[PDB]
Amino acid sequence: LRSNVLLMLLQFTLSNLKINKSSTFTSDVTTITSGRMIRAFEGRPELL
Amino acid sequence: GRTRVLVELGHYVYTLHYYDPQISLDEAPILEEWLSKINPAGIPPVPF
Questions:
Q1: How far apart are CA A16 and CA B13, in angstroms?
Q2: Alpha-carbon distance B16 to B36, whole Å?
Q3: How many Cβ atoms from other residues are within 10 Å of residue B16's Cβ?
Q4: Which 3 state secondary structure label does DSSP give A25?
Q5: CB within 10 Å: which end of chain A, N or C, has fewer?
């Protein structure tokens, strides 16, 4: 079990060695936060 | 005749409906139409 768990954690780590990239930042024009520089998930509102 | 709601808009666009005084009308559908178009994006002009 210690082999299979740790080899999953290596598969957890190396799957996750990416570079965080800023997409685009719009102002929240609506009233929900009223002007906060929201992450603009443009084409995918199902993740916003 | 239960609840009296104050609604705080600082400044707003109004639109007004001139009625005959000889005609009875419940003014709820004039304002439920106003409520039916409020989203967090915007507010339609207030039906006085």
A1: 52
A2: 17
A3: 9
A4: strand
A5: N
Cα separations in angstroms, B4 against A40, A43, B1, B7, B24:
39, 42, 8, 10, 22
Which residues in chain B have their CB less than 8 angstroms from residue A48's CB?
none
CB pairs below 8 Å between A and B: how many? Answer: 6
Describe chain A by its helix, strand, coil percentages, rounded to 5.
30, 10, 55
Tokens of A12: 């957890």
Technique used to solve these coordinates: cryo-EM
Structure resolution, Å = 3.4
Cβ atoms B13, B46 nearer than 8 A? yes
